[PDB]
Structure 1
């Protein structure tokens, strides 16, 4: 398929790797009894391994010649061959949480900046204001775009300190 890779559901090395992991786990399990805590723990780990391999093959991931999955970072290839869940959707998810945290911190700084002692509000966190801004940050992309359109997101050149060149 893409870049000479084969799907994990039809790769021989993938199945051999799964059999290798299950074989070493079963080999470690043969030394214990049947109704003991280590045996139950090993069986739980084996079930987790089976579920993980089944879920990875079910997701349609592309495996290589080593039997391990590969991620598709190109937006066109991901949206064209059903690989948007690898690197596209998590990218936008991180962008939302990253801008979320950044906007919450920026709002807290700008809010405490006009007070009498901002340094005290920086070392001793004002939990009520921080909690209110944390709950209000859900609309961070909308607020950031509206701030950018109004011209209030950036500071002017004359109000920023610079070197003597």
Structure 2
């Protein structure tokens, strides 16, 4: 496929890693009596290892010559389960955090004691901005068009140069 990589469901080294991973825990299992919670924990580990390897095979990941999954951050649609969709998710969440912080900063600036509102948070107002930052890509765009997002540039302090 891409870069000479094979699917992990069709790779022999991936299956060999599966067998080694389950065999290590099976060898660890032989010194415990059955029914003891140590035995149950070890067989739960074996089942979790099998489930993880089966999931990695089923999701369509590409494994290399070492038998380990390789992520394709290219932007292809068939590998959108890799980088691109977590990219969109993180961009939304990070913009949410930034917009909540910015909104609370505006509110604390507009009060009588801006310093005391930052070490001691106004929790109801902070929760209000924090929950209302869910529509940050629209509110930020509206503030950008309205000219409230950016200072003109002659009003921010600058070093003499």
Instruction: Tell me the TM-score normalized by structure 1.
Output: 0.95
Separation (CA, whole Å) in 1 of partners of 2:82 and 2:71:
6
Provide, for residues 24-48 of structure 1, a one-character-per-residue CA deviation record: whole Å limited to 9, x for no partner.
0000001111111110000111111
Which aligned pairs between 1:1-150 and structure 2 lie closer than 5 A?
Answer: 1-75=1-75, 78-79=76-77, 82-150=78-146
User: What's the offset of the Cα at 1:147?
Assistant: 1.4
Match for residue 156 of structure 2? 160
Provide, for residues 85-141 of structure 1, a one-character-per-residue CA deviation record: whole Å limited to 9, x for no partner.
111000000000000000000000011101111110000011000101111111011
User: What's the offset of the Cα at 1:155?
Assistant: 0.6
- The gaps in structure 1 that reach 5 residues or longer are none
Alignment size in residue pairs = 161
Separation (CA, whole Å) in 1 of partners of 2:55 and 2:143:
43
User: What's the offset of the Cα at 1:152?
Assistant: 1.4
Aligned-residue CA RMSD (Å): 0.7
